[PDB]
Write a protein that binds this ligand. Structure first.
Ligand SMILES: CC(C)(C)c1cc(C(C)(C)C)c2c(c1)[C@@](O)(C(F)(F)F)C(=O)O2
Lengths: 261, 131, 51
């Protein structure tokens, strides 16, 4: 499972980099300048980071070791959080400006996306400096393997966890969930606007709905299924992989299908 | 072939009450058979096949563009929500067998959400114009 | 409208399958349970396919 989803995430980051190179290869020489290419390529790099955050999720004591563990936990946290922020804040900025200018200048877009990313990074950093992540082991009930070797096995399972999780994690999940619901609401409200300065607000609306649905599904399931490593890992990995694949395609393949006549 | 009989499992004899001197052994009633996965898989295969043909034919009729019966957007959205939520529910219910409350809450919310969406997205767009 | 009545029939059938999950054995005998475990499958699948 680990190597299969890692191959999938690698192909995902390859496609994301190819697509960002394409979109910047036609930066302003065509109508692409209408649909803000900076927001789109910020979304692409956010999806690339979120897909790259799949490898630290699968690395445990089978590969790394005890002393190299707090680096894997930190890679998990920072890659996943910053990737989600950079890949959702751009779409939310696009849709929020499309909403509020119809109920403008391209520097307010960057100002507010920087504000969102800064807020996410500041809160994640303050959480990580207050109660840092560290290795913790949780044990199961004893069992008896009957290979006639006459020994009792005490199955253990280790996972990155702070001192008091399910509280800070709960706050992050709730804040991101309210942001995602606002994204869905604003995307639904402004599906009829036909602004010419911003070309693809309907595509970012569809991608926002998809990402929000998949994230709101896989956020509590991973907390419930925590004591099963394969279930939780497969759920998080497939959520990331599918959300990134679909947002990349629905956000970019119409551009390269219209440009190629 | 497989009448899907009733089976009961037991585990964890040692749990104790508030001090009433009993070894409360908890057991749980289930409904399995010999090969549950094969039958459930062929059922989901048939349902997904009809879902896929419906989505295909709904995409093929995308460009009719009459303000009265186009409605392919609603077909797409409803089948997307139903597919994803039923797949997640069928994956989660099997992984939480030893938790009856969580299993029941998951499957009940899945059914409620899918049915209410596939009903609203078909009936509320009509009754919003008739006002 | 007749197909719409069909889909509303399917939707209410699927709603009716919520009750047949919570029945565990503290409300039901040991013989009605084994028949509920197939009547709920019947109801759910026919409601979905009808709709
Ligand atoms: C993708 C997104 C823009 C967020 C969207 C969201 C909705 C919801 C009402 C379910 C919130 C929606 C549509 C699009 C549709 O246009 C349709 F395409 F599904 F039909 C619709 O009427 O419903």
């Amino acid at each position: 499972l680990f190597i299969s989803v890692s191959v999938l995430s690698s192909l995902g980051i390859v496609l994301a980099v190819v697509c960002l190179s394409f979109n910047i290869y036609n930066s302003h020489v065509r109508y692409i300048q209408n649909s803000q290419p900076n927001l789109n390529n910020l979304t692409a790099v956010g999806c690339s980071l979120a897909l790259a955050a799949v490898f630290p999720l699968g690395l445990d004591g089978y590969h790394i070791g005890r002393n190299q563990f707090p680096f894997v936990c930190q890679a998990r946290l920072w890659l996943l959080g910053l990737g989600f922020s950079l890949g959702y804040g751009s779409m939310f900025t696009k849709i929020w400006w499309v909403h509020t200018v119809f109920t403008l200048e391209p520097w307010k877009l960057y100002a507010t996306v920087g504000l969102l990313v800064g807020m996410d990074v500041l809160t994640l950093a303050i959480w990580q400096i207050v109660d840092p992540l560290h290795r913790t082991i949780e044990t199961f009930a004893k069992e008896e393997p009957k290979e006639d070797i006459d020994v009792s096995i005490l199955p253990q399972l280790e996972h990155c966890s702070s001192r008091k999780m399910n509280t800070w994690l709960g706050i992050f999940y709730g804040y991101k969930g309210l942001l995602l619901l606002l994204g869905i609401f604003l995307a639904y409200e402004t599906k009829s606007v036909s602004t010419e300065k911003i070309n693809d607000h309907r595509a970012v609306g569809m991608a926002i709905y998809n990402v929000a649905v998949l994230c709101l599904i896989t956020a509590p399931v991973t907390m419930i299924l925590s004591s099963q490593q394969d279930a939780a890992f497969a759920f998080a990995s497939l959520a990331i992989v599918f959300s990134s694949y679909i947002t990349l395609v629905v956000l970019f393949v119409p551009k390269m299908r219209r440009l190629i006549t | 072939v497989d009448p899907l009989r009733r089976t009961v499992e037991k585990y964890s004899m040692e749990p104790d009450p508030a001090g009433r001197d009993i070894s409360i052994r908890p057991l749980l009633e289930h409904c399995e058979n010999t090969h549950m996965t094969i039958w459930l898989g062929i059922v989901y295969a048939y349902k997904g096949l009809l879902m896929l043909f419906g989505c295909f034919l709904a995409w093929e009729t995308r460009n009719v563009s009459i303000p009265a019966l186009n409605d392919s957007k609603y077909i797409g959205m409803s089948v997307y929500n139903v597919g994803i939520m039923c797949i997640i529910g069928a994956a989660v219910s099997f992984l939480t067998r030893d938790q009856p409350n969580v299993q029941f809450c998951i499957v009940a919310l899945v059914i409620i959400f899918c049915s209410t969406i596939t009903l609203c997205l078909v009936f509320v767009p009509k009754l919003i114009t008739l006002r | 409208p007749y197909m719409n009545n069909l889909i509303i029939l399917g939707g209410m059938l699927s709603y009716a399958s919520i009750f047949l999950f919570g029945l565990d054995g503290s409300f039901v005998s040991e013989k009605t349970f084994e028949t509920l475990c197939t009547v709920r499958t019947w109801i759910l699948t026919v409601g979905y396919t009808t709709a």
